[PDB]
Design a protein around this ligand. Structure first.
Ligand code: ANP
Ligand code: ANP
Ligand code: MG
Ligand code: MG
Ligand code: ZN
Lengths: 398, 703, 389
DNA sequence: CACACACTCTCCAATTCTCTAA
DNA sequence: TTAGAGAATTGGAGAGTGTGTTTTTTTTTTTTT
């Protein structure tokens, strides 16, 4: 049991004497009056305190082989059904995001963010990022926060946080004086708490400057390096980020690029694998459908279940797809296309296509192959990943 | 005592008493002696002859035995060792002393005991996972050293003067458990205020360290567990606060009344009796290098293309950036500190600044340097402070007097400090490193402490320009936002750009996708393996020291003078006087890369090239070409000189033909040493003799 | 820990470098068998309050020869090319003026405060590192790494006895010598205002935790700083300085140092630096026409303890008239600019000229400062007045 | 220092063993 | 068959020895101002 856990303790209430008052051959002795008159106690008095002696502890209300053995034959059958399912992409999207009307591409991007790529270690020992980062920009009336809420209530080990900090440690970490030791110690932030998980950062445009700087290291190198008085540390932050942000002045303008519509700097922009934009169209049929869906969710409600998707995700994430040679050629040609296309706006403030976007294409194709439980990435996976990435570039430009 | 043919049949005993009795004790003694004498490695080399010889060369009193070798060669000793570690380590120490005095009969003058240390024990444990089942067993743990006492003298075999008569009480052994009380004098029975005989008492070095779980192995928001460990004899000062270590030792418990009264239950204090400390930083020390390793290093230095190999070995998973790899290689190997006349210190370390666009592998370069280098400190932007970088004063945790403590720059004193997001720092935090960057010291005057610490590190920083995108319309000074005092403190100043170029983009994409294929969980010149590179680096840094005899002062002086002129013209970068000393440092670093004991014009030309190319890189687009032709035509980009050796060869052939008509390679190299053109291997690889139909052979020596 | 006994008591003070000869021993009235160790000192060799007569008469000779000022100046930081006026001012700072107490009990400062301010890579830190080693009493500290308490004096409780005690800072440790404050522009303003009293009055008045006293801090401040914009950036003028007039008036000389890009200067400087790096292996042979640092240290100590000069009457008249002229010039410059200059020209600058003349005479062990000494002092000070105007 | 607790040792005499008479 | 006088063993009184004790201020540092 760990501090903060709510646990049921089964055992005995017992009584523990003040043992410092007792003198014995083994060891000699060191506002209410205790009981008196024992030989071991001498002229002193013995006080008591109540202590619970737990024979059992459990929570109060709760490897690859390990997964396989833990789960049941019916769960195996359901996993196999999902692995063989046609339209699995859209089925998982609809199952994860029932309240969301439309935004089917954003649903796909968030699903691949959940599946994630394959982390790798270079020959020299440096690590290549496997996690996928996604940012959803949109007007405050759009579904940007609802995507984060659905992800957080679906996935285990995930954190929801605002860009503005509720604590001295915001997103990354802080150094604070211990109240018991009077000594500087780490206070963990949202990314550290979301290590090997998903961090859903709402109002990402409103970060404090310490987080605005340290998120650079946290998003790409997946570490938080601290060098302060009393503490030197490298803290693991191996997290996938799902950010949500507002345009400057509170509404989006399609005539302007995303770089002009949000306050994120180019280094921060380069970290994200996918960007999405939500504009509140004043379309009567869309409002009609939104009201229908919401009130149906409140009144009538009282494909796949979230537990089934949890089991399938946990099963599928253990796959490590490999790159076929033809899919490698497809990735190379697609990146050449993307880069030479970006050359038409590199002089005019485009979301310039760095090498991080090549590696984001690699990550997204690997996530596709993981979703299909494939041993090897294929040109179909590369094409779908390129579709999402390319559409993000085009929507970012206009 | 008859030899015991089977130690393995305990015959109902436990291991402790079984090895404590005489028969199995002598059998273990003989087996360990035979193991030390006869154990050979995969090449057939007697490893322990070499190890004991090195130990006796260096007077080190301690012998590291690999548990893998012990388990492979002599099974039952490896079987009993973790079960009864104190007893078997005592027997091993006795046997090792016998073998050592067989090899070196006079080593008793240097030592009276040999400590056998055990390494690579498979019984690895997490600190959070130690249980009562591990008590009195040899465990292996990992953690960060968070506290250290000073090296203190501890009684080991103590003698007491009698409080009344002149008798001295017999040798009593100290236990680590309790104070030894003398008892009563056997001459007269007095038991009064006895006192230690300091001169006849035997002491041992003592140091108590506290280790805790490493901060990256503890969970976020969770408090770390910790253990005390006792270091005795030559294990003291094996580590300092902040060191990541692996600790092999006996997990030991004893009664503590303080814990009993704190808990209300008979809880026993625990401590680790350390047997072997190995810093996870220094996986290979200079003492670990074997004759095979140094033979490999020295023979590999004779390749004569080793500079290109060493440059290519810097971050082998990064395409391109040859200038970055060159600068980082020079910084990683480093120059020599000098102090002419004992009154004028100049730094030997080379500082590097990588400025440029996002997604250009600057951080990956920094993490590579962190991984490859011993004594690497990594820090980032707002995560650093002036105080944390340099040094900090605190109340001591227990005694509460003000005490100075080491910051990152002090902890990296003979290593590398890596500062990512360098432009994102505060000015107050960034100005702290000036003294450490140039004067290589940190002077603190706080709370009664007035002292200077050594901070002789090499700073490698990464930064972005203003707006997160480099602008060729502007110079470096116009788009960096840093100021002249900090800009001038960086010897090598690199600009990395992410401009579109389709052929390079295609090649880079193929390299990146190939890297992702190669590293799945499963330039031309070829690099070294990284293990070999690490061994090569530490040998080059510690066993080799370049010395400058001459460097053709006119060339560098004229270069510096007109580099100052053009810097004043464009305003791109301040040049001050530090660039001259950067030239000397880079030349020494290249000499160290080649393992030269003396610097030469090859190294000087390399340093000249690095300086001129980086300065040209600081310029604008239009200005850059004019600067290129300026410094290229007038100053020294000494690529090659094949024409002189070509016509020397032609002259020698013409004279030889004229002599014969009416050993040429020896004639050629004789003339090549007479003239200052000694780098003849370049001519033998070049085309200029080949299309003129000459050829060479080191055996026949005909051309 | 060191135990000293009988005449070894007060043979050394904090800051002294020593070679101890002693018995390594345990105290004899964390762990069980742990004993605390110390050295019982049996001899002390201070590495380096007395001059042998041979050193004494040699110092008389050295003061007697006519170009002693030039010899001293060439001895200041011999590895540094150029900066002759700065080296001369540093020599004046090392020797110091003469401290005085007037009939009404008021004290006049004798020490000389010097600020080097300007471009990077101009050997300011090397000059500080030389002066800290050459001065008989000398401490080096970074402005960034210092505080008000750690510079002047700190108050703290002792774990051995619960009472408040004082611990000396940089100024107290350097009392009688020089504090070399590198990175002087980097220190906090609240920490920088701590040293005003210790700079002018040469005292540190503490009233904290019940203990109320006034310690001595009779030490020179030699400070190094950069411009507000890194380089001097000559169009900016007075905006290059963020120091207050209060602190700036306490500096006798303010050498504004600018890195001049001249081609022959750069060639000579580069050849000097290259030869300096080349010559590190040459067995450290003796040199003509200069004083070794170990000898110049002793000579400075001898002159300081022996000689306190005064101004001659005619010399004082010269100084008076020149001071009035300089004051009128400074007033008219500020009036023409319609803005106050960062460097004020005050009565402390008059007394600074007096101190510099007395230091020049003290180099020669002359009881009186001549018109020549006053002229040289005014020449050095008019570099600082150039730096003002 | 000095005044209470905590512990051991010794001596003294009270009880039980042995042998005898009522 | 009971019990009482002389000798030996065991209970415990007490004499002697050894142990333990009687909110405050200045300064730093990170984060928050
Ligand atoms: N030339 C290259 N060869 C190989 N990988 C590259 C190259 N350029 C960029 N990358 C990859 O790009 C990713 C980002 O590298 P990184 O070092 O974080 O960029 P950066 O220089 O730090 N930009 P920034 O953090 O904004 O200052 C890594 O996965 C690198 O492997
Ligand atoms: N005239 C000179 N002669 C010899 N070495 C010099 C000279 N000028 C500068 N240097 C060298 O330049 C380096 C920097 O010297 P330093 O003392 O730090 O100057 P600085 O003005 O204090 N630099 P900064 O702290 O940025 O203002 C040292 O290695 C000096 O030896
Ligand atoms: Mg970076
Ligand atoms: Mg300086
Ligand atoms: Zn005795």
């Amino acid at each position: 049991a760990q501090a903060g856990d709510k646990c049921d303790f089964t055992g005995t209430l017992i009584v523990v004497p003040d043992v410092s008052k007792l003198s014995t051959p083994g060891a000699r002795a060191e506002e209410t009056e205790g009981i008196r008159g024992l030989r071991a106690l001498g002229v002193r008095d013995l006080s008591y305190r109540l202590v619970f002696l737990a024979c059992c502890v459990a929570p109060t209300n709760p490897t690859a082989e390990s997964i396989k053995n833990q789960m049941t034959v019916k769960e195996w059958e359901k996993v196999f059904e999902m692995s063989q399912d046609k339209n699995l992409y859209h089925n998982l999207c609809t199952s994860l995001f029932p309240t969301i009307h439309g935004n089917d591409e954003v649903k796909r991007g968030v699903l691949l963010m959940l599946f994630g790529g394959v982390p790798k270690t270079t020959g020299e020992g440096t690590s290549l990022r496997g996690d996928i980062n996604v940012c959803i920009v949109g007007d405050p009336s759009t579904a940007k926060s609802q995507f984060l809420k659905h992800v957080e209530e679906f996935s285990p080990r995930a954190v929801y946080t605002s860009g503005k900090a509720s604590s001295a440690a915001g997103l990354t970490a802080a150094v604070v004086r211990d109240e018991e030791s009077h000594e500087f110690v780490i206070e963990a932030g949202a990314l550290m708490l979301a290590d090997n998980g998903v961090c859903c950062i709402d109002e990402f445009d409103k970060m404090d400057v310490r987080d605005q700087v340290a998120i650079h290291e946290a998003m790409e190198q997946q570490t938080i390096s601290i060098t302060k008085a009393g503490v030197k540390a490298t803290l693991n932050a191996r997290t996938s980020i799902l950010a949500a942000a507002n345009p400057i002045s509170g509404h989006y303008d399609r005539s302007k690029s995303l770089k002009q519509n949000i306050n994120l700097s180019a280094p921060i922009m380069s970290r994200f694998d996918l960007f999405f934009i939500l504009v509140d169209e004043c379309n009567e049929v869309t409002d009609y459908a939104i009201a229908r869906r919401i009130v149906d969710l409140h009144s009538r409600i009282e494909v796949y279940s979230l537990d089934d998707i949890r089991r399938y995700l946990l099963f599928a994430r253990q796959f490590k797809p490999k790159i076929s040679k033809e899919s490698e050629d497809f990735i190379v040609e697609q990146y050449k296309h993307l880069r030479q296309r970006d050359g038409s706006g590199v002089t005019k403030s485009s979301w310039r296509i760095t090498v991080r976007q090549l590696e984001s294409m690699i990550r997204l194709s690997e996530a596709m192959a993981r979703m299909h439980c494939c041993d090897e990435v294929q040109p179909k996976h590369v094409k779908e990943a390129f579709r999402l990435l390319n559409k993000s570039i085009i929507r970012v430009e206009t | 005592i008859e030899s015991i043919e089977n130690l393995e049949d305990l015959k109902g005993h436990s291991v402790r008493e079984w090895v404590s009795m005489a028969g199995p004790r002598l059998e273990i003694h003989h087996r360990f002696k035979n193991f030390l004498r006869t154990h050979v490695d995969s090449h057939g080399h007697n490893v322990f002859k070499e190890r004991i010889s090195d130990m006796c060369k260096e007077n080190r009193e301690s012998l590291v035995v690999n548990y893998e070798d012990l388990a492979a060669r002599e099974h039952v000793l490896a079987y009993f060792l973790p079960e009864a570690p104190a007893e078997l380590l005592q027997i091993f120490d006795e046997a090792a002393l016998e073998v050592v005095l067989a090899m070196y009969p006079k080593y008793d003058r240097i030592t009276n005991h040999i400590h056998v240390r055990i390494s690579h024990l498979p019984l690895v444990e997490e600190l959070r996972s130690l249980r009562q089942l591990h008590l009195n067993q040899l465990i292996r743990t990992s953690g960060v050293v968070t506290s250290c006492t000073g090296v203190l003298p501890q009684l080991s075999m103590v003698k007491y003067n009698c409080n009344k008569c002149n008798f001295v009480l017999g040798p009593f052994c100290q236990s680590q458990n309790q104070e030894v009380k003398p008892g009563s004098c056997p001459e007269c029975q007095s038991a009064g205020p006895f006192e230690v005989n300091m001169e006849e008492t035997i002491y041992q070095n003592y140091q108590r360290i506290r280790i805790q779980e490493s901060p990256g192995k503890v969970a976020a928001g969770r408090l770390p567990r910790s253990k005390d460990a006792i270091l005795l004899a030559d294990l003291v000062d094996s580590c300092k606060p902040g060191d990541e270590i692996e600790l092999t030792g006996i997990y030991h418990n004893n009664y503590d009344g303080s814990l009993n009264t704190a808990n209300g239950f008979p809880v026993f204090a625990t401590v680790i009796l350390a047997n072997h400390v190995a810093k996870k930083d220094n996986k290979v020390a200079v003492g670990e290098l074997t004759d095979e390793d140094v033979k490999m290093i020295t023979s590999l230095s004779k390749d004569q293309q080793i500079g290109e190999k060493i440059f290519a070995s810097i971050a082998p998973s990064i395409y391109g950036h040859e200038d970055i790899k060159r600068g980082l290689a020079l910084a990683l190997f480093g120059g020599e500190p000098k102090n002419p006349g004992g009154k004028h210190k100049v730094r030997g370390d080379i500082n590097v600044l990588l400025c440029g666009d996002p997604g250009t592998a600057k951080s990956q370069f920094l993490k590579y340097i962190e991984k490859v280098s011993s004594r690497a400190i990594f820090t980032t932007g707002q995560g650093a402070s002036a105080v944390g970088l340099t040094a900090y004063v605190q109340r001591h945790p227990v005694s509460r007097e003000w005490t100075l403590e080491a910051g990152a720059l002090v902890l990296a004193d003979r290593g590398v400090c890596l500062i990512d997001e360098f432009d994102k720092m505060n000015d107050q935090d960034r100005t702290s490193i000036h003294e450490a960057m140039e004067q290589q010291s940190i002077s603190i005057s706080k709370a009664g402490i007035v002292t200077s610490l050594q901070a002789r590190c090499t700073v490698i920083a990464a930064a972005n320009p203003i707006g997160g995108r480099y602008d060729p319309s502007l110079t470096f000074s116009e788009n960096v936002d840093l100021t002249e005092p900090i800009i001038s403190r960086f010897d090598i100043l690199c600009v990395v750009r992410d401009t579109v170029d389709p052929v390079q983009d295609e090649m880079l994409a193929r390299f990146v996708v190939g890297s992702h294929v190669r590293h799945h969980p499963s330039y031309g010149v070829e690099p070294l393996p990284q293990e070999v590179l690490k061994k090569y680096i530490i040998y080059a840094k510690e066993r080799v020291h370049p010395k400058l005899n001459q460097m053709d002062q006119d060339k560098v002086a004229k270069m510096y003078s007109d580099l100052r002129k053009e810097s004043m013209a464009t305003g791109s970068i301040p040049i001050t006087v530090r660039h001259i000393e950067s030239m000397i440092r880079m030349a020494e670093a290249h000499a160290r890369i080649h393992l030269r004991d003396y610097v030469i014009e090859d190294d000087v030309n390399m340093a000249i090239r690095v300086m001129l190319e980086s300065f040209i890189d600081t310029q604008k687009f239009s200005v850059m070409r004019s600067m290129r032709k300026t410094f290229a035509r007038y100053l020294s980009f000494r690529r090659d000189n094949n024409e002189l050796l070509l016509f020397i060869l032609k002259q020698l052939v013409a004279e030889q033909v004229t002599y014969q008509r009416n050993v040429p390679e020896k004639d050629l190299v004789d003339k090549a040493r007479q003239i200052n053109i000694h780098n003849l291997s370049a001519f033998y690889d070049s085309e200029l003799f080949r299309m003129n139909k000459f050829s060479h052979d080191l055996k026949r020596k005909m051309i | 820990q060191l135990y000293c006994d009988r005449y070894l008591c007060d043979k050394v003070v904090p800051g002294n470098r020593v070679t101890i000869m002693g018995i390594y021993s345990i105290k004899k009235f964390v762990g069980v068998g742990i004993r605390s160790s110390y050295i019982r000192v049996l001899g002390i060799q201070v590495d380096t309050g007395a001059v042998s007569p041979q050193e004494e008469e040699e110092f008389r000779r050295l003061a007697a020869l006519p170009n002693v000022y030039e010899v001293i100046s060439k001895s200041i930081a011999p590895s540094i090319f150029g900066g002759t006026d700065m080296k001369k001012a540093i020599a004046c700072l090392l020797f110091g003026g003469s401290r005085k107490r007037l009939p009404d009990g008021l004290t006049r400062r004798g020490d000389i405060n010097l600020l080097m301010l300007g471009d990077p890579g101009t050997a300011k830190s090397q000059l500080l590192k030389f002066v800290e080693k050459c001065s008989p009493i000398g401490v080096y500290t970074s402005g960034k790494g210092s505080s008000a308490a750690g510079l002047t004096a700190s108050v703290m409780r002792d774990p051995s006895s619960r009472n408040f005690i004082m611990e000396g800072g940089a100024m107290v440790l350097a009392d009688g010598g020089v504090v070399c404050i590198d990175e002087f522009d980097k220190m906090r303003e609240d920490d920088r205002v701590a040293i005003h009293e210790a700079m002018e009055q040469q005292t540190i008045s503490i009233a904290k935790a019940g203990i109320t006293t006034t310690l001595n801090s009779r030490c020179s401040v030699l400070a190094a700083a950069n411009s507000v914009f890194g380089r001097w950036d000559e169009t900016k003028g007075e905006d290059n300085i963020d120091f207050m007039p209060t602190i700036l008036s306490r500096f006798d000389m303010i050498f504004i140092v600018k890195d001049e890009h001249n081609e022959e200067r750069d060639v000579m400087l580069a050849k000097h630096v290259i030869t300096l790096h080349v010559s590190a292996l040459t067995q450290t042979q003796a040199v003509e026409g200069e004083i070794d640092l170990a000898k110049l240290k002793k000579f400075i100590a001898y002159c300081r303890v022996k000689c306190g000069p005064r101004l001659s009457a005619e010399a004082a008249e010269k100084l008076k008239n020149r001071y009035i002229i300089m004051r009128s010039g400074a007033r008219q410059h500020e009036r023409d600019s319609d803005r106050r200059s960062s460097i004020p020209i005050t009565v402390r600058q008059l007394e600074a000229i007096v101190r510099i003349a007395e230091a020049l005479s003290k180099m020669k062990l002359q009881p009186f400062a001549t018109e020549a000494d006053v002229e040289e002092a005014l020449r050095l000070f008019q570099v600082s007045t150039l730096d003002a105007a």
